[PDB]
């Protein structure tokens, strides 16, 4: 019969997912060793399962391990360190996160003969170099998940011809605007997508041909490795210790709490770093202006709409506007641009 | 056995070619340093190889270099500058372009003992002065081409008695109309071909003798050096910067896009120069009227059919009509007049 569709993202910041039925999940990419949650169940009921993902994951040898994963793992003091996390796409940390995003997006009582076409992503520079790693790992993927405290398990095993690879930010403007940008694309124009990710910033462009079809410009588009939201969290971590003059250091929860607001509540008091937050965000925005113009010479004039996406684009939209003011806009769902783009352009097959 | 036939043109605007089997190619005369195309292969398939000519060219020392050549090189921002391109016929830029036109016109699985008679051209004033340059260079020509992304290679090496030189615009009306103009040539008449090329405009005539055979009039025919389509692109480039009043300047892609339409899409807006386009095309047409009458005194009355050809003749046919209205016509394939003329009049041998 027909095979199901689930679009997932493998972003180091936060795993983003959506299914065929437009139910979507989002949670930070943090795991920890799960332990038995029974006492805290009595105090506060788990209304939202996304907040409290305790999970059990089997394998082919049925060697289960518990995992605090996602939002609950951020509350744990022994979690994955997440600021020097492994960059390997075949890591067990990526294995658990991939299982969890599949766990929340398979609805109840699907037919077991009906499989799932899953659509994933790689960074745009790494889509050729690191292709066969995730291509073989998803072939190697054979587990069975178990949700503690909610008592529903899912079987997770994929053959070939179910998995599907598209680059990061590719289908976000290849599809998802293809019905809408027909009035906006004209001829010999350029559209631009700037995904401000956590570790790596994506810059991807497309040329509109004479036949009013998009086509890709690999010499006008690249992935900025080492430039992204992580440079803010790495800088403001140093800015806190220098403001402390004690050697005290925020943990992984306090640090990710910091650069959403800039005002951590530290030792009965707010330690204010609001000046260094606005300063470092312009510092990141400057290193996306000047790197866009490295790929874009006088070609910058020929654009018609620079879209931006990613989680970081939402918090930088005013500062990042000055690449091309009053032309550039914001995509509709800044996190789920890669998700919906993998969904619709994954529905081609 | 029988030796194959390929007719090529060496026009600075766009290389025009045709084979013995009437398969013909056309691409602009732009090269650039080729790089590895693998990521863009995944996005959009190369259906037409003429659009996406990535190529590898060996030599006698097997020193290969990659080349983005033709339409793809126009999309590159580091290409051959093409507005001050070298006029040398023995340049490496001419070497690569000559190899590429031979690459697309040798069909699959020809016998290696069967060679190819290639027919080229020189400008009509330069056919005597610059004869031995291309005559020796094609003797010096020894390479082996490799098409990336399509995986077919061709061996390219020519001895003497395969190469063949005819002037530009010569065989276009010497042959290619010789079967058809029998009803139109009478006696002591003049036929005229005006090739509006990119850099140089060709004016070539023929006298019909008493024996109803064509014969050449070198004092009634010359090549207009410095007059041609390039004077439009050089003028409208100045017209854009003067309309901008910013110092901004179009690149090689935007400039060649301009004077096919006159309306470049510049910084979210159309910068209109439609008035200066119609004005400069009459300015070029005036400098072909007055230069034709420099060679043609009261001899102008004795014509019977002024043909025009070249790429520029197609876009100037209405303005250039006023040399001799309602006598003058347009050749059938305005680009391939030199190509088919080199083909049939190259089939004499
Ligand atoms: N409301 C917010 N306030 C501050 N930062 C945010 C907010 N939402 C998202 N972010 C930042 O955006 C990042 C998420 O980026 P994301 O689009 O998931 O890219 P990736 O695919 O690389 O993980 C987070 O690391 C976070 O720092
Ligand atoms: N559709 C078109 N619109 C505008 N200009 C054109 C068009 N087709 C051809 N041309 C012009 O004609 C030139 C091609 O001339 P061509 O016949 O190749 O002469 P040459 O042998 O000197 O290269 C191009 O440089 C271009 O400017
Ligand atoms: Mg991303
Ligand atoms: Mg010509």
Author numbering:
A (entry chain 1), B (entry chain 0): 1 to 349
Q: What text appears in the publication on this structure?
A:
Functional ParMRC plasmid segregation systems comprise an actin-like polymerizing motor (ParM), a centromere-like specific DNA sequence (parC), and an adaptor protein (ParR), which attaches a plasmid, via the parC, to each end of the growing ParM filament or filament bundle. Thus, the force generated from ParM polymerization is harnessed for plasmid segregation. Here we investigated the ParMRC cassette from pCBH, a 257 kb plasmid that carries the botulinum neurotoxin type B. This ParMRC cassette is also found on other C. botulinum plasmids, such as pCLK (267 kb) and pRSJ2_3 (245 kb), which encode neurotoxin types A and F, respectively. Despite the similarities to actin, pCBH ParM is a genuine ParM, since it has a closed β-barrel, a feature that is missing from actin and MreB structures.
Within each cross-section, an intermediate layer consisting of six hexagonal protomers showed the best local resolution. Inter-strand averaging for this intermediate layer led to a 4.2 Å map for the protofilament. The major difference between the monomer and filament protomers was the folding of a disordered region into a helix in F-ParM (F helix). The nucleotide-binding site in the pCBH G-ParM and F-ParM structures contain ADP and the magnesium ion is coordinated by Asp9, Asp195, and Gln168 equivalent to Asp11, Asp154, and Gln137 in actin, suggesting a common mechanism of ATP hydrolysis in which Gln168 (Gln137) directs the hydrolytic water towards the ATP γ-phosphate for nucleophilic attack. Next, we examined the pCBH ParM filament structure to understand how a single protomer forms strands of different lengths and twists. Firstly, the central interaction region involves long-chain charged and polar residues between subdomains 2 and 4 from the lower protomer and subdomain 3 from the upper protomer. Secondly, hydrophobic residues on the F helix from the subdomain 2 of the lower protomer fit into the hydrophobic pocket between subdomains 1 and 3 of the upper protomer. The hydrophobic residues in this interaction have fewer rotatable bonds than in the central interaction site. This architecture allows the hydrophobic interaction region to act like a ball-and-socket while the central interaction region is elastic due to the flexible long-chain interactions. The linker residues on either side of the F-helix are relatively flexible, which adds further pliancy into the intra-strand contacts.
